[PDB]
Amino acid sequence: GTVWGALGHGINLNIPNFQMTDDIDEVRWERGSTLVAEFKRKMKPFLKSGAFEILANGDLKIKNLTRDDSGTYNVTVYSTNGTRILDKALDLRILE
Amino acid sequence: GTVWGALGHGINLNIPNFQMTDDIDEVRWERGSTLVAEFKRKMKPFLKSGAFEILANGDLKIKNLTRDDSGTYNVTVYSTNGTRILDKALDLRILE
């Protein structure tokens, strides 16, 4: 919902029904097609596990395809000023 | 839009109409409500400008509210294993 601020003064936008814990590694705040700020806990870029690899050009590699690996993957690309320039849902299907 | 893979082999999910350039800061891959991988050009967390600040509990501070700051802000929170804990929208209304 709605948050009310006063023109010319500062404001803290609170994450609704949340408390920061040791298990949270990232918070992302976006507005429109712009990334505004991020909180990170770790130095390394995230990688879910050893079954995946991110290539040097940004492509995602799935190492040994499984029937449970099919479905929709969403890729989002941000420029150096925070603009979301590309967003795409990709349908990964099995050739059966 | 649709990528086809054979079971038992590796598959590359290519970002369509895309060439990794120097203006690209982040590439994020998600599968539903789970983060899978990310490319990050810089180690430091992103911050759009000095007008904003990310607090240590994850809340966003807008230091001096202007009329262009009203609107909807989206916050998404990820845990250590990539699960998206929350995805909420806040509407900022300004009093003068």
The dihedrals phi and psi of A7, each to the nearest 5 degrees, come to -55, 130
Q: Which residues of A touch B31 (CB under 8 A)?
A: 71-74
A33 vs chain B: nearest CA distance in angstroms?
11
Residue B11 neighbours by CB distance under 10 Å = 19
Both structure tokens of A92:
């990964």
Q: Per the CB < 8 Å rule, is B34 touching A48? A: yes
Resolution (A): 2.0
> For residue A47, what is the DSSP state?
B
Q: Per the CB < 8 Å rule, is B4 touching A94? A: yes
The dihedrals phi and psi of A59, each to the nearest 5 degrees, come to -70, 150
Ordered structural domains, chain B, with CATH: 1-96 (2.60.40.10)
Q: Which residues of A15-36 are buried (b: 16+ CB within 10 A; e: fewer)?
A: beebebeeebbbbbbbbeeebb
> For residue A56, what is the DSSP state?
T
CB A60 within 8 A of CB A75: yes
d(CA B28, CA B39): 6
